[PDB]
Ligand binder design. Structure first.
Ligand SMILES: [Mg+2]
Lengths: 50, 232, 147, 83, 100, 231
RNA sequence: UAUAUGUCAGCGUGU
């Protein structure tokens, strides 16, 4: 089902795309898994810990 | 071979939209296309001057973490909306615009008072919403020209007369560009086959022209390389 | 001219204060220690380098010695004062001096996660790759060709 | 600069009295107003003391001999001044 | 909102008292960043009643963990509402869905 | 300062490890500019530096690369590898042909090549092969050409299309004078801004030109490329 | 360095 949903859009079914290095502009030798992940910010702030 | 390098020239500029734009550099020698594209992309994404909103002042508002009677959006939400406003300033380098609105409706960027030098790229950019007939909003917006991302915390360091209660600081993102991409393709010049053509696609906020941005990036790169030209 | 003036200047964070701070930390070791000090290697002396931000930057290779991961772990730093304490930190408790575990003599500085993967990927052979079978004058030519 | 003290350790041979000797030399430089036996490459007192210990110019015996010589010359000078 | 969820966000958001849930159906007579006035339908009107429900959202109230508790309206003026429909989004809520 | 004002290096330090080895330190630089400058210079020097290098060579009595000759300690492949490292400076024309003939016992240095006015050898003591038999002789025709960057022999053999004349073994051409270039970006502090970039460039060349001259040539090439859009 | 006035419980976080 995930692969079908990926195919519905213009995205590869493998889930990995080709990425280029920002600093050097050279394409990475292997495909890298990119996507969207739900990330949370925990209540452990560095400025409150110094 | 020693002096056979072909100087790239700005051939065609394609403005597919108000923000999206495409520029073409041709001809380019083998290998130079990638170098030039990477350098231009890295320079444009970081060191492009532009105008942004710095300080705001509303008559009935004392601090960001407050509410105004008759507006749907919070004061913090209003500041966040103003942060994304796109405005171009010609010569003043610092402008104070005034906005006044009343009645039920969406208060957008088109309601800002007309100034000769300034120009609003997106008049339909919504700022807030008034949900009461007697609700009235009056606002003063400070627009400054700068470079890069300067958070308000660093600007707090200035201590001349402090700030009156009611002047809200807004983080400034002076960069007009938001997306830069480049690609090298085969170029046809006379009967030479080993030539490249560079296509640069730029998505910005509409406050800068692609040709001006390319010229500025090239000037910055040349100024930086002038140190290596005379190594001493 | 007085202690009060120096206090005011360091509170105002003048430009000369940063140069003075750079001068005083040139070769003054600092003791980094983790909260659970199970064994000897739980506290080690390091040369400080001024950085921005708000988090202490730790060498990866010593993490296995500290049993520390960057998941939210915290570390404490102490400043030796007398010349004797600084010399003990430099000669006895320095990170470079601690290379073998006192428990069994095994080394404590080993690549763990990314160095090993990078070296493994770099030192590998494909039976049919780009530029196979050619002869190179040396490692410099190989680096030039790869780049 | 200094990254390791292994050569200084082998020059002294114990690694425990080496700290004491280096501390004595550093106190002599910092407080006694002495002069380094090695070029001063803007290094700290402890690093300079370790560096000059490394090439064998400073040890316990040498420091004791120099202290004895300074004491004898100061005693001779004060005796001449008294007389 | 979580792009990938489990479908239990709505239940968690509604059951907790963070969000403002309409007690009776009607239309949004007056909307504001700090208060909402809903004109209830005649079916749910009690006899001898004015017929308006007033919800006063909490704006930037300190929580037990020194965090910010803020309620933002999620309805527009004149938009019809029903019983059990969320009128304002509490902290970490997006249109009635939990958003951590 | 100004929106159009950028920081420029002022701590340019040059360390000469060897006659062909150099290390250049530039500080301070704007954040992220060190990577751009280093990558651009590295790419230009590695791929787009004009220079003269050996293209192909023919040796009497040798037909292919998998051949052997009597009296030479070094193999044909090792002879080609040694010829690859030879650095030749030509100021006369694009393509030159030199002849190397020798006989006897001992090494065959680059000083034994026939003298030509335009062709200059920066390392006359460069070793090509060793002759072990006094009756054995070595006679080869080296061809040097002017080009840019590195051209592997595979591309040349795929684009020769001259029916592969016998005895003319192809050898990789290293036109670019640079033998190795690396660049590091470190943290540098000005006043209170500790996030500035400092660029360290370590370069070894083949001896034809100084590494500083190579840096100057690369910068000049980039400036000439960019001059069209400079205003 | 001596500054304005810190002690016990309960709860929680990381190894
Ligand atoms: Mg942990």
């Amino acid at each position: 089902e995930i692969k079908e949903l990926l195919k519905l859009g213009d995205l590869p079914t493998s889930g990995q795309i080709r990425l280029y290095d920002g600093r050097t502009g050279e394409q990475f030798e292997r495909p890298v898994t990119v996507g969207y992940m739900y990330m949370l910010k925990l209540n452990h702030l560095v400025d409150d810990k110094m | 071979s020693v002096t056979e390098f072909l100087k790239p020239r700005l051939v065609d500029i394609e403005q597919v939209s108000s923000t999206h734009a495409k520029v073409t550099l041709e001809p380019l020698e083998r290998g130079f296309g990638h170098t030039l594209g990477n350098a231009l992309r890295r320079i444009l994404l970081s060191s492009m001057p532009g105008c942004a909103v710095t300080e705001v002042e509303i008559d009935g508002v004392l601090h960001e973490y407050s509410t105004k009677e008759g507006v749907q959006e919070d004061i913090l939400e209003i500041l966040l909306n103003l942060k994304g406003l796109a405005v171009r300033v010609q010569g003043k380098d610092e402008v104070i615009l005034t906005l006044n609105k009343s009645g039920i409706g969406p208060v957008t960027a088109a309601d800002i008072t007309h100034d000769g030098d300034v120009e609003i790229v997106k008049p339909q950019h919504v700022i807030c919403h008034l949900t009461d007939e007697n609700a009235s909003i009056s606002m003063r917006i400070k627009v400054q020209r700068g470079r890069g991302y300067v958070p308000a915390s660093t600007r707090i360091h200035s201590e001349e007369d402090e700030r009156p209660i009611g002047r809200l600081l807004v983080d400034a993102c002076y960069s007009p560009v938001e997306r830069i991409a480049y690609n090298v393709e085969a170029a046809r010049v006379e009967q030479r086959t080993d030539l490249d053509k560079l296509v640069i696609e730029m998505e910005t906020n509409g406050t800068i022209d692609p040709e001006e941005a390319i010229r500025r990036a090239a000037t910055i790169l040349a100024e930086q390389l002038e140190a290596f030209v005379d190594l001493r | 001219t007085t202690i009060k003036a120096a206090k005011k200047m360091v509170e105002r964070e003048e430009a000369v204060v940063w140069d003075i701070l750079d001068e005083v930390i040139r070769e003054h070791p600092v003791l980094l220690n983790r909260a659970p000090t199970l064994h000897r290697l739980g506290i080690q002396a390091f040369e400080p380098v001024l950085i921005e931000g708000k988090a202490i930057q730790l060498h990866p290779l010593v993490c296995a010695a500290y049993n520390a991961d960057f998941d939210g772990d915290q570390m404490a730093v102490h400043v030796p004062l007398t010349l004797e304490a600084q010399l003990e930190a430099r000669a006895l408790m320095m990170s470079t001096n601690n290379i073998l575990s006192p428990a069994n003599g095994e080394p404590i500085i080993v690549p763990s996660q990314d160095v090993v993967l990078g070296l493994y990927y770099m030192t590998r052979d494909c039976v049919n790759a780009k530029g196979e079978g050619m002869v190179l004058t040396g490692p410099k030519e190989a680096e030039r060709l790869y780049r | 600069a200094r990254v390791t003290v292994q050569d200084a350790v082998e020059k002294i041979g114990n690694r425990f009295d080496l700290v004491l000797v280096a501390a004595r030399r550093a106190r002599q430089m910092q407080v006694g107003g002495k002069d380094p036996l090695v070029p001063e490459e803007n290094d700290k007192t402890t690093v300079i003391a370790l560096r000059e210990i490394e090439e064998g110019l400073i040890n316990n015996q040498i420091l004791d001999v120099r202290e004895r010589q300074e004491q004898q010359e100061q005693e001779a000078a004060e005796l001449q001044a008294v007389t | 909102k979580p792009l990938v969820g489990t479908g239990m966000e709505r239940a968690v958001a509604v059951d907790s008292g963070v969000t403002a849930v309409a007690k009776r159906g009607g239309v949004v007579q007056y909307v504001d960043a700090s208060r909402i006035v809903i004109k209830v339908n005649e079916d749910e009107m009690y006899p001898g009643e004015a017929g308006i429900d007033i919800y006063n959202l909490t704006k930037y109230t300190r929580s037990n963990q020194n965090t910010c508790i803020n309620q933002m309206p999620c309805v527009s003026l004149g938009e019809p509402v029903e019983r059990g429909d969320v009128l304002a989004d509490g902290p970490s809520t997006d249109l009635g869905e939990l958003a951590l």
